[PDB]
Ligand binder design. Structure first.
Ligand code: CU
Length: 128
């Protein structure tokens, strides 16, 4: 019944959530990302990126290949459903997207595209 979720990305290269369930009653969903850490954006930058579980690997690979000058996300990557900007220590960013971009029974994954972060910074998302 809640169409938003507060998520944190810290200096331990960890998100504080492993799973997110988007309620069908929601026409839109909001992700409020914050960085409670103290490490510089260049060494511990975090973002919240959503894609199907199948597309995660490709998005992550082409993301790091795009460098910091692109918030580690390939421009016009159709595989990306939604994303927050790349934030550093003490910062916050929110993104709201149309839930109609998701379908029941499909596996989605949220993750950080900063090089190497997705090893720990990834979780599941489903429409239910
Ligand atoms: Cu990160």
């Amino acid at each position: 019944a809640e169409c938003s979720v507060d998520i944190q990305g810290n200096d331990q290269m960890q998100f504080n959530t492993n799973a997110i369930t988007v309620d069908k009653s929601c026409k839109q969903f909001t992700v409020n990302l914050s960085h409670p850490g103290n490490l510089p954006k260049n060494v511990m930058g975090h973002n919240w990126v959503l894609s199907t579980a199948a597309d995660m690997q490709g998005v992550v690979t082409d993301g790091m290949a795009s460098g910091l000058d692109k918030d580690y996300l390939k421009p016009d990557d159709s595989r990306v459903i939604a994303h927050t900007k790349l934030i550093g220590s003490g910062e916050k960013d929110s993104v709201t997207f149309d839930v109609s971009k998701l379908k029941e029974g499909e596996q989605y994954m949220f993750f950080c595209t900063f090089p190497g972060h997705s090893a720990l910074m990834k979780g599941t998302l489903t429409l239910k």
